[PDB]
Amino acid sequence: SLARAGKVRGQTPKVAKQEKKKKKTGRAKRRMQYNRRFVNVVPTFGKKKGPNANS
Amino acid sequence: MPKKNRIAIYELLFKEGVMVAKKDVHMPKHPELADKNVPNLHVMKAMQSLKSRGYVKEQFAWRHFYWYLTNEGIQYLRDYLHLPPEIVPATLRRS
Amino acid sequence: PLFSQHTAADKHKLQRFLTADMALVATVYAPITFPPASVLLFKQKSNGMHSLIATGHLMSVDPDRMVIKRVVLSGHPFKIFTKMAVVRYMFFNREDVLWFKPVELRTKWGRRGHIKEPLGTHGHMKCSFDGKLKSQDTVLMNLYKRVFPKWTYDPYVPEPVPWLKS
Amino acid sequence: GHQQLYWSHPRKFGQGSRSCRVCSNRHGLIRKYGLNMCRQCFRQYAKDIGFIKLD
Amino acid sequence: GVMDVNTALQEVLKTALIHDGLARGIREAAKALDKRQAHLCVLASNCDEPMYVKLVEALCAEHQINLIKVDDNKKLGEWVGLCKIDREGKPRKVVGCSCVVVKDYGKESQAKDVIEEYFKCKK
Amino acid sequence: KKRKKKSYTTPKKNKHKRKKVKLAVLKYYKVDENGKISRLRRECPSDECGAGVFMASHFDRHYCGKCCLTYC
RNA sequence: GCCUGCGGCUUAAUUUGACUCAACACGGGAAACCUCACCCGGCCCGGACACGGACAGGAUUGACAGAUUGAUAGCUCUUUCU
């Protein structure tokens, strides 16, 4: 009566991970988080756009 | 098409900038190409040949294709018939 | 051996190939041993190197555990009316369709149907369904037979040469 | 092709040789007063041709 | 006589395609020059069939057609113009013809000068 | 409605791939030692295929390839 | 009694949508062909374009005759010409 074990893990097409350039760490990362939020400010009328917001 | 039919279509374009059609498969001939004896089936697809390359512009309204010459479409017809850069089309003429 | 689904039911679906992550039941005529017992599987590669392919254990030993070989026959719905459609390329005769009349169809997009009339002298069939089919669809029926393993038992197995990597 | 039997059936009289001038359809056509449009494509351009629903 | 000997045949073949008279190949080149309408002809020297060279030159001098010589079959088709080009202008792909028949000339005082004098002293 | 597929007859009727007779231009003319040019086949009495286009030698007849004119 | 629409049933197919008012002389649906989606047999390419293969010593196009073919359908075959 029904009941597979981990059906949806074994049905998913195994997509290999892309090779990107490494992330900066520590103080370097914080620096990049600072300049992305307070320094190069782009003007908007009411601010309705997020940071990750894809479309 | 035979090569007699290919080069009738291209003469009336560079003079003017416009070629039109009726979208008729049963058509014996196109009326602009008069006493030149090209079926109007042949006006369509050579003008469909230059769209996928990027030369003519489709903008369709009421069963009759309209077409213009691209800025890059201008230089294409000057290599085929060899018209010189001494002669302009009807675009750069008036006023 | 015969590989199978490791289920709790009576019928076990045959697996035609051994999968890299699934746990499978190998079914073979061997002289009866009592569980629990470990079970290893090797294969003679080249120059007599035994290659470990599959590890497990011994489950219940009984001939009553039926392994079922399935055959899924594809077809094409090329004419679609509402709830009744015309399928080709699943059969090629007329009485091929008439043989598999009581076989209930299914569909890749999840429709559950069954054949009505055969029409052509070539394999064409009218088929009823629960809902309306997409044209982008594929009709398919499932056929089953019971399969039992080959009698290839020899207790003698050659001594392997020392194993190495490629 | 070929030319002798490609479009050989005579598209004289009859609704296989009348099309809407807007949408190239052959059903529901209004050919009164030389409209030659479909009955639905008349209702888009009913006012722009100049017909008024007075009563 | 500024254009050189085989060099002067580059200007000749460009002008006819303004008015479309270069019938290429083996089959039309005999017949369209049988047609009492065309001026001259060339046969290439790189040519492999023995029955090829027999038929071509015999119809010429009877119907008052003089012959020049250039070597290659690769060479006398780039003047016919079948060869495709790359993005930077390299002759990427070659399918050349070993026969040319010129029917209508253009008007070039570079092309007409050098090659017509070649024929007088040959007589 | 759903579609009956119906893809079956006496299986195919394949088309004509074009005949490659290699160097058939050598067949028409025959040149002797002096340059003798005897034209083996017929010149058409028409206008568009006169003096440039030759005709056909079948087993009992004539058949032009341009204007499709037939003698015997 | 008949005209036409729906179901129902035979049919190669007797296309299809519509199902209480709010489906059923409705789809301007009075379809000989066409329309036409349906069924049978055949044709055409109407696969633009980019790149590779081939191809000019011709890639390919058109085809009388006769057989076949409903078809003066070069559609296939012989015939060998364009």
From Swiss-Prot, chain A:
Superkingdom in the source lineage: Eukaryota
Subcellular location: Cytoplasm; Nucleus
Positions with biased composition (Basic residues): 19-32
Modified residues (N6-succinyllysine): 47
Region span, Disordered: 6-32
Subunit structure, interactors included: Component of the 40S subunit of the ribosome.
Reported function: Component of the 40S subunit of the ribosome. Contributes to the assembly and function of 40S ribosomal subunits.
Designated name of the protein: Small ribosomal subunit protein eS30
Species in which this protein is naturally found: Homo sapiens
Curated annotation (Swiss-Prot), chain B:
Signal peptide bounds: none
GO CC term (a single one): synapse
Primary residence: cytoplasm
Subcellular compartments: Cytoplasm; Nucleus, Nucleolus
Phosphotyrosine: residues carrying this PTM: 10
Any one GO MF annotation of this record: structural constituent of ribosome
Subunit structure: Component of the small ribosomal subunit. The methylated form interacts with NPM1.
Task of the protein: Component of the 40S ribosomal subunit. The ribosome is a large ribonucleoprotein complex responsible for the synthesis of proteins in the cell.
Protein name: Small ribosomal subunit protein eS10
Protein species of origin: Homo sapiens
Gene assigned in the entry: RPS10
UniProtKB/Swiss-Prot annotation, chain C:
Subcellular location per the Swiss-Prot or TrEMBL entry: Nucleus, Nucleolus
Transmembrane segments: none
Lineage: superkingdom: Eukaryota
Function: Required during maturation of the 40S ribosomal subunit in the nucleolus.
Assigned protein family: Belongs to the TRAFAC class translation factor GTPase superfamily. Bms1-like GTPase family. TSR1 subfamily.
Protein name, UniProt field: Pre-rRNA-processing protein TSR1 homolog
Chain's gene name: TSR1
Residues of the full protein shown: 627 to 792 of 804
From Swiss-Prot, chain F:
Post-translational changes noted in the entry: Monoubiquitinated at Lys-30 and Lys-36 by RNF25 in response to ribosome collisions (ribosome stalling): ubiquitination promotes subsequent activation of RNF14, leading to EEF1A1 ubiquitination and degradation and rescue of stalled ribosomes. Deubiquitination at Lys-36 by USP16 is required for maturation of the 40S ribosomal complex.
Superkingdom to which the source organism belongs: Eukaryota
N6-acetyllysine PTM sites in chain numbering: 27, 36
Zinc finger (C4-type): 44-67
Stretches the record annotates as Disordered: 1-18
Cleaved signal peptide residues: none
Localization terms from the record: Cytoplasm; Nucleus, Nucleolus
Cross-link Glycyl lysine isopeptide (Lys-Gly) (interchain with G-Cter in ubiquitin) residue location(s): 30, 36
Function in brief: Component of the 40S subunit of the ribosome. Part of the small subunit (SSU) processome, first precursor of the small eukaryotic ribosomal subunit. During the assembly of the SSU processome in the nucleolus, many ribosome biogenesis factors, an RNA chaperone and ribosomal proteins associate with the nascent pre-rRNA and work in concert to generate RNA folding, modifications, rearrangements and cleavage as well as targeted degradation of pre-ribosomal RNA by the RNA exosome.
Subunit structure comment from the entry: Part of the 40S ribosomal subunit. Part of the small subunit (SSU) processome, composed of more than 70 proteins and the RNA chaperone small nucleolar RNA (snoRNA) U3.
Protein name (record): Small ribosomal subunit protein eS31
Source organism of this protein record: Homo sapiens
Lineage of source species: Eukaryota, Metazoa, Chordata, Craniata, Vertebrata
Gene (name only): RPS27A
Location of this fragment in the whole protein: 78 to 149 of 156
